Amino acid sequence: ADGLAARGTFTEQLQAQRDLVKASDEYYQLADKRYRTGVDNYLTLLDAQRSLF
Amino acid sequence: RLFKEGSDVKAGQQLYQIDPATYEADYQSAQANLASTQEQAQRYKLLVADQA
Structure with missing residues (x-):
């Protein structure tokens, strides 16, 4: 059940983190x-490069 | 008065002196401001080649 909870939430978490990376790339x-x-x-x-990194 | 009267003067020869005393003071102000703006321009000319 712990692994099923992780599988349920990590998709939304990685989609949000990848959108954050894309917005930092656009800012750079x-x-x-x-x-x-x-x-x-x-x-x-x-200053923008390390904010992307 | 800086000329012999009844003589031939040249174009650009100084005739009088009208006590500057204010035209010296504002000239000191302008030279004092130039002495800092020229220095900042000369430093920024060196820094613009290194993109600083």
């Missing part, structure tokens, strides 16, 4: 666009 790509344009320096992009 937007910070990279602001860096390549010229508005942000490199320290903000390095």
Whole structure:
């Protein structure tokens, strides 16, 4: 019954964590666009990379 | 007064002196602000090549 509870809840938990990873990737790509344009320096992009990691 | 009267002067020769004393003070203000803005521009020119 413990394994059935884990099988029941870990699908929703990993779907939420994978959506969090996708949103962090989109935030990193937007910070990279602001860096390549010229508005942000490199320290903000390095701040976004470890938030993705 | 800095000219002999009734003589031939050149274009750009100083004739009088009208006691600056205020035009020196605001010039000191402008030079004092330039001395910091030029330094910040020269430091940012060095940092823009390293993307800092």
